[PDB]
Amino acid sequence: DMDEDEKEMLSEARARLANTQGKKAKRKDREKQLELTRRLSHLQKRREL
RNA sequence: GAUCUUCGGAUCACUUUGGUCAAAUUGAAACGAUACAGAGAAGAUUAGCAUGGCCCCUGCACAAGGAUGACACUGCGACAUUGAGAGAAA
Ligand SMILES: [Mg+2]
Ligand SMILES: [Mg+2]
Ligand SMILES: [Mg+2]
Ligand SMILES: [Mg+2]
Numbered sequence: 001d002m003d004e005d006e007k008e009m010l011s012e013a014r015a016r017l018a019n020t021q022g023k024k025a026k027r028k029d030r031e032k033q034l035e036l037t038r039r040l041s042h043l044q045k046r047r048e049l
Numbered sequence: 050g051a052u053c054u055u056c057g058g059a060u061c062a063c064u065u066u067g068g069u070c071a072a073a074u075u076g077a078a079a080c081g082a083u084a085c086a087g088a089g090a091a092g093a094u095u096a097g098c099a100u101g102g103c104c105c106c107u108g109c110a111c112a113a114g115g116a117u118g119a120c121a122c123u124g125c126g127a128c129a130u131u132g133a134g135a136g137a138a139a
Contacts, residue, residue: 012092020091027088034086 016092022089022091024089025091027086030086
């Protein structure tokens with residue numbers, strides 16, 4: 001337990017240090033990812049037609 | 050027509066029309082239904098003020114609210130070289 005719990009906090013800390021984007025960065029990129037993914041299906045409909 | 054007065058002749062009164070349709074689908078609000086997604090500040094929860102306009106609603110308002118109303122970028126570069134080595138073209 002004690003060896004295991006030390007290794008958990010050591011991995012959680014590597015996440016904190018790694019990313020600074022915040023809520024607005026993550027939600028703004030998903031909007032890009034949805035719009036881009038939406039087109040690829042929409043453009044295939046144009047070639048299909 | 051009326052009043053004077055020769056049956057002539059006077060005199061009074063003078064050009065309307067507020068129209069985005071000439072008869073409610075195809076010429077002046079959009080919202081609503083549905084589907085998805087589902088709320089700032091570098092752990093998580095959290096008050097806010099501003100900031101900039103081809104974004105705007107509520108409001109008599111130069112009060113105040115509306116998520117802090119919402120939305121918001123950050124490669125370039127006015128190009129020097131040094132010294133050496135290799136390559137193709139004069
Ligand atoms: Mg306000
Ligand atoms: Mg808030
Ligand atoms: Mg409020
Ligand atoms: Mg504001």
